[PDB]
Design a protein around this nucleic acid. Structure first.
Length: 92
RNA sequence: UGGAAGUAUAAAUCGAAAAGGUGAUAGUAUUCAUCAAAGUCUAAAUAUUACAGGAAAACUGAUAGCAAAGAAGUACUGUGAA
RNA sequence: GAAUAGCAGGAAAGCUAUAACAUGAAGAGAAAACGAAAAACUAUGAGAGUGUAGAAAUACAUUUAGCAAUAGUAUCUUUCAA
RNA sequence: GAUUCACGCAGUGUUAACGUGCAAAUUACUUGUCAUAUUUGAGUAUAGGGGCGAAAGACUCAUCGAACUAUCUAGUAGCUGGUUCCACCUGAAUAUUCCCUUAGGAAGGUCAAAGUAUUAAUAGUAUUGAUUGGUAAAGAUAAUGAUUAGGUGUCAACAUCUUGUCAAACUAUGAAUAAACAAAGAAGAAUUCUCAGUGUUAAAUACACUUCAGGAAUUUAAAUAUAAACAUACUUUGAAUCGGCCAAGUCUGGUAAGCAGGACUGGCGAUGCGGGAUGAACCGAACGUCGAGAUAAAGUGCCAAA
RNA sequence: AAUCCGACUGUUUAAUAAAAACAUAGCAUUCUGAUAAAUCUAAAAGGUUCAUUACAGAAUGUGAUUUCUGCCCAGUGCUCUGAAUGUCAAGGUAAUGAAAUUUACUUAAGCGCGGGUUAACGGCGGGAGUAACUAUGACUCUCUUAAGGUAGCCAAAUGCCUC
RNA sequence: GGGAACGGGCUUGAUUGGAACGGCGGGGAAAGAAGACCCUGUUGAGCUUGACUCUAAUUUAUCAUGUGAAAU
RNA sequence: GGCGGCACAUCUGUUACAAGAUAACGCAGGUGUCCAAAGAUGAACUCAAUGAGGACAGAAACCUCAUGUAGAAUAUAAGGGUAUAAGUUCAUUUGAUUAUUGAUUCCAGUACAAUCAAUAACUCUGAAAUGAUGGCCUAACGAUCCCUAAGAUUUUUAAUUAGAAAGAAUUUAAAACAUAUUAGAUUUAUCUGAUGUGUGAGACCGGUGAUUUCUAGUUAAUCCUUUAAUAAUAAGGCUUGGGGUGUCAGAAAAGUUACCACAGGGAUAACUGGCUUGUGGCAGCCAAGCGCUCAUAGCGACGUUGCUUUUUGAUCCUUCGAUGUCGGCUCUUCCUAUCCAUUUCAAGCAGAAUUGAAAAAAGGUAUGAUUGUUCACCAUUUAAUAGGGAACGUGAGCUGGGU
RNA sequence: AGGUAGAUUACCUGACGUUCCCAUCUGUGUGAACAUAAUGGUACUGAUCAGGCUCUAAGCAUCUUUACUUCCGUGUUCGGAUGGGAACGGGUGUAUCCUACUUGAUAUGAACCUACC
RNA sequence: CACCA
RNA sequence: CUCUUCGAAGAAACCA
C-alpha cells in the first residue's frame, strides 16, 4: 500500500545489513527476437487466421505488487512480492 | 520440411564476382577444413495386385471362393452417369 | 532366421557362417565437466548337531550357522539439491 | 386486358366416393374459367452455394430449406440393439479426489487369479486403569436472549424477594451409546558387576542419545477374559462398478405424499425355500442329490396336514 | 340490406392452404455520358442489358382513382464542392554500431471533426406552473437523447382488463 | 386383491358343451411409423448479425526505367 | 427445460446424530479486500457501565473518588482468544530478509495453497531470559506453454618468474608453400614453370632431460551452450518472482429455426391412472350470541374433528421402436351428498305457500338467442327442469368449430 | 512467629466488623544527585522522626460464593430386542446403563526451598 | 411477473 | 496497451 523507500535489509552479496533503495517492478518491453515471439511470427504467417488462443475472460481486478529492493553500495537487486492491493503508493 | 533468426520450390522487386559455396543459432572479423554450382548421358544391384504364360498352397468347396463353377458384367432396371 | 554369403538335394523347408548392431553389464546432470568399498556394521531370522525324558510319535536344555527379506546405519559416484 | 354459353381446362365445396384405390393424387356432382398477361406441339437456351421463379423456399425426371450418381467410406458415435458348449470354485459396486464434469472417464475402495514369507506379522468382542467429547437430559434473577403475575422499598419508574412458561444458530452441570491408549516384541523378563563416544553442564561420577552403545555372570517363560495355523503378513497383474431401492422404539424441507434429502445397521439388487390368500424388501431360514427324525415362523370347523 | 380486405383482368404452395398472399398500372426514390452503370467468368483482342444512348440502362419502396402525406439529422446508414498535422501500413530518409539490429523523422485511403440527407433504417416521452368552482389546460417554463403522435382512424384481421 | 400404482395368464372367488354363420364396433392399453411435442448429445443443417477467425469483389499507397524542358 | 439464483473456488454458527466423515435451489451471514503500521519488540496504564460530587453544562461535552471478570476494544462476517493483555498511549525498528532440511492440514496420502519444527547467516527490541521468516485464529485465491525481471564474483584454471621432487619420450615410401634464386612473358588490383633451404619431422647415452606435479608470488580468464577455433552483439539453458485462467486442476466463441434433421430418454415435461388433499366440495362436536321473551324452530362466532377425488395444486412410479390430445352429437350403466313424484317426523306449521330432517336411487329430470367453449348469462315451458363417475366414458362411432 | 521465592490456582474470592507487631514487612520523612512525570501522587534516589491507622497475616458470623458428602432418584434420559398394545399421536414389559437442578450436613486451605526470630 | 404443451 | 485532447472522450492495438 504505502511503503517507503530507503529500506535497511540484508544483502546476500555483502553478507551484511546495508541500506537499500525500494522501487516498483514494471514488466519490461517485449523483445522481437526471443524464441517464443519468433516462433509465433512464423505461425501467424500464411492463411489460417488466428493460430493461437486469445484470452478474453479476465476476472482479476488487481495485480500483485513486486518491489525491487536494490543494494545501495553493491547494486544487488532483490524482488519481493506483496499481497494484492487496489491502491499502492511509494511513500517517503 | 524433422530443419528450429528459414530445409526446398515458386512469384514480385533486386541482382554479383581480378571467382566462390558449405561447416543447420542471426551478426562482423581472422584462421582452419572440404568442395568448386548455375549444361548432358550413363549399365548393375531395386519395384510390380495391369496383362499374358506357368508352378505351388495347414486357402474356399456352390448362401463359400471373384459379381460371375452354364450363351456373367449375362438377364433385368434407369433419359443418363450408372 | 540384420541384411547377406555358402552346403548338400532338385528344397519358400533344414544346416553353417568370430558379425554390424539391439538390450544389459554404471549412474547422476539442463550442459560443460564427471563417474562408486571402511574387501562393510547392527537387529530378527532359514539349517545342523549333542544330551535327557516321556516313552509311540514328541517335547525340554545346550553348541554352532547365520542365506532370503525388512528396517536402520558408516562409506563412495553425480547434482544447487539424495 | 366488357358480360356469358359451348369444345376444352382448372380444382371452390361435398371436408361425397375411394383410401391393402381405376389411380404412389383418381372419380362423380357442384363451382370457376373457357383468345391477346390466351391455350398448345416440335426445335433450341439456362445446371447444383448452380439455374428458374407474377415469390409458395415453389420447380429443377414420383428425389429439393440445396438433385441424382460414384469415390474418400467399413465416415464418427460417451447413444440403441445383438454377442454362439457343459460342470466346479471364489464372488462384488453406488464412498473419496479431479475432469466443458452430471447418459461418460482417470486415481481409489469392494473382487478374482497368479506368486510368496516362519511371521516386532491377529481382533467390527468383553473386563480393569488413566483420559477425550458436549449429544439426550437439566437450568431459567446461574452468564446471553424470551416471557406471566405477585409482595416490599424509594402513578409510573428503578431496585429487590418470589412466581408461571421457553431456545437449532443459550448455557453452569451432563449421561447411554461411542473414540483413541495401556495391560511387558531391538525381537519373553529382571537384577548385579563392568563400562565407552559425543553433548548438556559452573564442572560433572548427574543427565540425554547411542541395537535399555557394548561385555560378562545369576535368576527367569510371569504379567485380564475370549477366539485365532487351510492363522497371519502380504506382493503383482487385472475384471466389473460408482442411475440404486427398502425397513426402522431416527432426523431435516414440506399440509402431506408409494414426495425430496441425510446418520447407524440389516436387507433387496445378486435370492430361491416355509409363513403372511396374492406381494423385491415383512417373519423363520439362506439352497450339492437323497432317506428317516425331531423343529422355526406360524397354525389346528371345511377348502388344508394338525 | 350492410360490414372487412384486395382497386380491377391476371398468378400462386404438381400431392391437405387459391386467399386478404404475388403481379399490376399509378406514385416516388437512387446512380450512370456509354472507355459508363449493373454484372457473369480462374483468365481472356472474353460475356449480358447493348442491333443500346437519359422519353435510355440499371437498383428499389408503395400499390388504381379522390384526399393527405405531419414533426425529428441526436444514434446507425449514405453523401460532401469541406479543416489540418487527432489517430492511422508496408515503404522512404537519417543517426549509432564491426554488423545484424536499434532509434528518430516523413508518408495514402479509412475512421474521428464539420455540413447535407428520412417516399434512408428509424423515433414521436417525462416534470413544473395556469382559466370566476369543476375538472381539464388554450397559453409559459424545463431537460433527456433530435423531435414529442399532427391530419385522421378505433374494443378494428390492431384493446390485456373485456362478454 | 396384490403387482411397474388400469391382468388373458398369478391369488381367492363367479362361472364354462364341442364346432361355428350373419352383424357389430367395448376390449385386445388393435395395425400402420426406431415420437414429429419436451429433454439430453460436448450430433447436424437452413437463415441472420460489428458472435470469433477468414475470403472473392471494391478501394488506397509503393515498385515495376518512353523522350524533351521547368520548377522543389 | 427456460427466466430467476450460484448451492461452481471459498469462511463462520446451526441442521449434525457428545471421535472422524457428513445431504438438499436447508436456515442466518461472509470473501475477491485492508494495513510503514493495523508488522516486531520494550515500557506504562485499564476498558464498557453505575453511584456520588464540580460554573455555564441540560440525559449526552470535560474533571475527581468508589465499585467495576471484560458486560469495552481488537480493519472486516460469525464463532473462538485476550486484563501488570493480544486492548489504550509512548519509544526504537524493518525478521513483511537470505539459504537448507523434516513434517502436518486438503490429500489420490499428487500439485497448488496453508500450518509448523529445526539448522546456518545478518539483523531489530529489551538490562535480560526470551520474542521476531508479516497481521491473535479459522476465508481473503491460481497449472503446462509464452512473455518479463532478479541471481550464478567465494572458487577453479592457463602463462611467465623463484624454489623443490619425481620423468626416453617408438622406429625407415610426404605434400602445403612463408619464403630466398633463376627462366618465359605482362604492364596489370600482373602472372606462369623449375631448381635450394628451413618449416615438420620423430630411433638420447647410471646421466642428461622433453614432460607432469608442489609451494609462494604476479599477470589474465572465470555460471553452461550456439557442435572446425576464438572474440563484442544476439539467442538458448539452470533457479526464483510477476503478467491468468472467478466455468476458480485453468477451451480462444452470438442468435434463430413454426421448413428443420439424426442418435437416444419414460434417467425428463405436456393427457389418464396411482400416493397426498394444502386448495375445492361436503359433513360433524362445543356453545358467545341472533332469533320481540327463548343458546339449539331456523342459525351459529371463537376454537376444533372428519369424509370425497367431481377443482387446482405437489411428485415424476408406468408409458418417448406413439395408449389419437378439447367440446358437441348418439347410447348404456353406475353413485347419492335427492330436484320431482311416494311414505313419515318438526316448525316461530290457523289455511295456502314454504323451511329442517328420515326411509327410498325402481321411474323422470326440457326448448332456445350469444360463445368452439366446459363455464356463464338471459327468454320461456315444466311435477322437476339435481349434482357427479365410467382412461377428465365414448374419433377402425361421427364432426373438425378450438387447439 | 516473620520475610523472599514459589507450586495447587476461590477450602485461597467478596462484604461487615475484630487481634497483635517483640523482630520482619508495611505504611512513614526528604528531594541532592541517577532517574521521573502536567503533579516527588506514581516511578527513582537519600533516610529513620514518629505509628500499628491502613495494608499484610490470624481469627468471627444460622454471611453470599467456592470445594467434598448424602439425598434428589434408579426419577429424566438411554443401548439391545416382538406377528407386544394404539386409527393416529405417542407410550409398555424384558435383559441393562443411569445424569442434572435442588435441599441438607461439613470445610473455609494444604504444602515446598532459603534467611531471620 | 408469468415462456412450451 | 500506445498516441491525443477535456477521470471522461477519440483513433489504433491484442498468443499467458
Amino acid at each position: 500500500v504505502v511503503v517507503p523507500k530507503t529500506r535497511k535489509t540484508y544483502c546476500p552479496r555483502c553478507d551484511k545489513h546495508t541500506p537499500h533503495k525500494v522501487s516498483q517492478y514494471k514488466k519490461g518491453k517485449d523483445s522481437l527476437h526471443v524464441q517464443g515471439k519468433r516462433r509465433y511470427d512464423r505461425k501467424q504467417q500464411g492463411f489460417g487466421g488466428q493460430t493461437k488462443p486469445v484470452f478474453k475472460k479476465k476476472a482479476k481486478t488487481t495485480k500483485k505488487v513486486v518491489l525491487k529492493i536494490e543494494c545501495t553500495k553493491c547494486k544487488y537487486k532483490l524482488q519481493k512480492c506483496l499481497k494484492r492491493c487496489k491502491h499502492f503508493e511509494l511513500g517517503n
